[model samples]
Every structure is written in structure tokens, then in C-alpha cells.
Target: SMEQVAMELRLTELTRLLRSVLDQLQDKDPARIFAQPVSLKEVPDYLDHIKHPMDFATMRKRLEAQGYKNLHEFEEDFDLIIDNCMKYNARDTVFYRAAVRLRDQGGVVLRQARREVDSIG
Candidate 1:
């Protein structure tokens, strides 16, 4: 139970990081490349965020309006966001490592969804 508590706290912290990433992408796109949406519809549900779950379609639409690209470009913004957070919380720390691991696990699910989408058409 203690471990679960600690893990949940870590997940909560990582969700904070996710918010940071979302915030970092706001208002300005690096104006790079790609078209696929980052698809954050599942993130709020996954993290149990108490809101509209921070969907990316709206953000993507805004970015696209401002000449910013897509998911790949957003990934670059995300990379910068996580990099800044890592500077404050060293990568070697157990909490930091576990947090990143949790974030990455979501990537596998995204990949599966992508494969399924590709299969359908």
C-alpha cells in the first residue's frame, strides 16, 4: 500500500509535468513539420485530471492556424518541456526515472492505436 501511495504521488507529479508540456505548447508553435494530432483526449482520463482532459485537437487547431505543424512538432515542444523539468529533477533520481517510464508507457498505447488506425485504412 505504501508503494502504491508513492507510485500514485509520482504519477500525480508526472501529470503535472504533462500539464507543463501542454502549457509550453500554448500561444506559439515552433512552426515545424507534421500533421497528426498529439491526441491528449485520453490523457486527462488516464491521469484523472479534473477537467475536459486537455485535448490536443484544440491546441493543434490553434497551432495550425498560426502556421505551426502537428504531433511531431508538438513532440519537439514536449521534448523541451520535459528537458526543462529534468534539469530541476535529475534524470538519475528514482522518482524522475519512474515518472518518465510512466509517461513513456502511454506512448506504447498510442502506438497501438496508430497501428489499428493504419490497419483500418
Candidate 2:
């Protein structure tokens, strides 16, 4: 059951990371997501392999276009976003891969939804 427990922990960490990023960005703090200005020069490395062939660079481009602004603004808050993601859900192959794409690529688009979270928060 080690695998199952690990999977659950990953899912929980994913949910928490999502929540943290949502919290900060929703409040218009995106312009400050990163203090170092994202020197990694791409979507965080952990998200790379999980990216789909069809959708891989799609997110990289958007994040780049944004100048890595929003996510970077909440760097501490996103707190090892890649690490939590890689740990909690890397092996699912289907859903998790899709999830990574969604997280990396869909991040900006879905970020708009955080406004709703702001209202609720």
C-alpha cells in the first residue's frame, strides 16, 4: 500500500499547491510571483516530461509570454509546485499527465477562475 499512500499524499499536495497559487494570484499579486524573474527560462523542469507531445510547448509559450509573471509572483506560495506535483501524481500516466498539462498550460486560463475564489475567500 506504499504506492497508494504516496499517491494520496501527492494528490493532497497538488490540491494544496493549487489552493496557494490561487489564493495569491486571485488577489492581483501575479506581477510579483517570482523575485528572481524566473531564470529557469521555461516551465518548471518537473513539468517537462509530464507535458504531452501535442501540448508540451503550448504552456511553455504562454508562461513565457506572461513573462513568467503570475506563478512567479507567488513563488513561495506555490512552494515547490513542481516538487509537489512530481511527488503526488507522476505515475498515473493519463490523468496526471493531463493534469500537469492543465496545471502548466492551463494555469493562466484557469487563473481567471481564482477570482471566484477571491470572492469566496
Candidate 3:
């Protein structure tokens, strides 16, 4: 009972932290590029280059589905979003540049969330 309640509270806190991190990322993405899955028709070579595709919409779906076991798992998907972009797009391209920025700024948001979660337990 008491242990179960504590576990539930921790899960709630983690969900809130995850949502906050996603919100920050979505806000930072001005082009909405990472909002949805990439269109194969638009970029035929995308799958050819990127083996694993990740996006904000998919991340949200996974979060709602309780697919993430912890903050580290959630961060893996977040990192994949940026990594996929950088891998698919050329370094000199806008998409790649955006990924770099997201990686830098989003990293801070993630780390802060990590600290919050770690502090609680």
C-alpha cells in the first residue's frame, strides 16, 4: 500500500517531467520538422540513410502508451530524433543545423529534468 502509493507518485512525477521536456522540444522546433514522421515521398533516400526514424509525435504516442520505462529510455528516443536528422541530412543543410541546435538546447532541458527526477529519489 504505502510502497505502491510512493511508486505511483514517482511515476506521476516522471510523466510530468517527460511531458515538460517534450513541450520544450516542440516549441523549439519552428519548422515542425520533428513533429511528425518523415515522408518517404519527400525524401526518398531517408530510410536508406537512417535505419531508425524518430519524431515528436511518435515520442508522445510512446509516452502515452507507457512505452518508456524511465527517463533514460525517454531520453534515448529524444536523442534518436536528433541523431536521425543529423544522419539523414548533410552537415551543411538546414535540417542538420536544426538538429544540432536541438541537440544542444534540448540536452539542457533533458539534463534539468534528469536532475529533478533524481532529486526526488
- Quantify all predictions' global Cα lDDT against the true fold: 0.42, 0.42, 0.85
Distance (Å) between predicted and true CA of 28, model 1? Answer: 24
TM-score of each: 0.32, 0.25, 0.88
Residue by residue across 7-76, what tens digits does model 3's lDDT show? 8877777777788888997888888879999999988888878888999999999877766669889888
lDDT of 3: 0.85
lDDT of 2 at 42: 61
**Predicted model with the maximum TM-score:** 3
Worst 10 residues of 2 by lDDT: 51-60
Candidate 3 displacement at residue 117 in angstroms: 0.8
Q: Give the Cα-based TM-score of candidate 3 against the true structure.
A: 0.88
Which candidate ranks first by lDDT, i.e. highest?
A: 3
Model 3 residue pairs with clashes: none
Query: Candidate 2, clashing residue pairs?
Result: 10-88, 32-73, 33-72, 33-73, 33-74, 34-72, 34-73
For model 2, the superposed segments whose C-alpha errors exceed 4 Å read: 29-121
| Candidates' RMSD to native | 19.2, 16.6, 1.8
Candidate 1 per-residue lDDT, tens place, 1-121, comes to 9998976665554444444444443322323111133235733333332222223444445443443223455454444333433443467875356436534654554455445434632
